[PDB]
């Protein structure tokens, strides 16, 4: 989907309820054309972030199926993301024989959740993705055998 699809449906299904939270400083929403959106609400200091997270949790569920139900399969992620990254890891070896996909697969498959179950790891962001069984259709042979992608 595009940025106009996520412009005022998923943003303005949330941002009208996000006002009235306790000691709110400001809200900042953002939406991309590659199909992502991120809303960061921030409050003044002194408040513990867990009660603010559960306040946002009991507030945004006023309009949780009012957004498109197909992206509900991916789920609304709620995170106490701070501002920035602490450290990065992971690299190829000197011998080669690895693309830039199998390394990301090995990172997100074997070392990701043991990294995430350790202490203090609040969020992560991995460059690349896992393996997926990609099935590349050819339209000519689909026309040949009288088949549709459905």
């Amino acid at each position: 989907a595009s940025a106009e699809t996520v412009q005022d449906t998923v943003v303005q299904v949330i941002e009208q309820q996000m006002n009235g939270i306790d000691n709110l400083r400001y809200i900042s929403s953002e939406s991309n054309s590659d199909g992502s959106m991120t809303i960061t609400v921030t409050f003044e200091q002194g408040t513990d972030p867990d009660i603010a997270q559960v306040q946002v949790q009991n507030k945004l569920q006023l309009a949780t199926p009012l957004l498109p139900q197909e992206v509900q399969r991916q789920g609304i992620r709620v995170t106490k993301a701070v501002k920035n990254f602490l450290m990065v890891v992971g690299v190829v070896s000197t011998d080669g024989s690895m693309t830039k996909e199998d390394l990301s697969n090995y990172i997100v498959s074997n070392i990701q959740d043991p990294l995430s179950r350790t202490k203090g790891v609040g969020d992560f962001q991995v460059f690349g993705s896992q393996y997926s069984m990609r099935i590349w259709l050819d339209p000519a042979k689909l026309n040949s055998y009288q088949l549709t992608p459905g």
């Binding site: 990254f85 990065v88 890891v89 830039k100 990294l115 203090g120 997926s132 990609r134």
Partner: protein
Amino acid sequence: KVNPDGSQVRLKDVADVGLGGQDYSINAQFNGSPASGIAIKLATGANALDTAKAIRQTIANLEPFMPQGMKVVYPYDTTPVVSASIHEVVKTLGEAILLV
């Protein structure tokens, strides 16, 4: 689809199946060579140095299970500036108290 006379067409010719990537949007290079990484954001209200030591330990315990053609480096870290800053300030504390 399969016709009752034994004729058939499968998902072998009309498509090609390969164990590829899931999202080809972002990709990473380290000194020109292709690599991949995962940036970690620290939790709200947690110390940095002990968590970095825990990250190093949870890498060091399972690095024997990695293949021969793999390795791990730390392309971006922020704990040495904290270690150097507290070392500098305890050094100037000692210099100041002896000078007084």
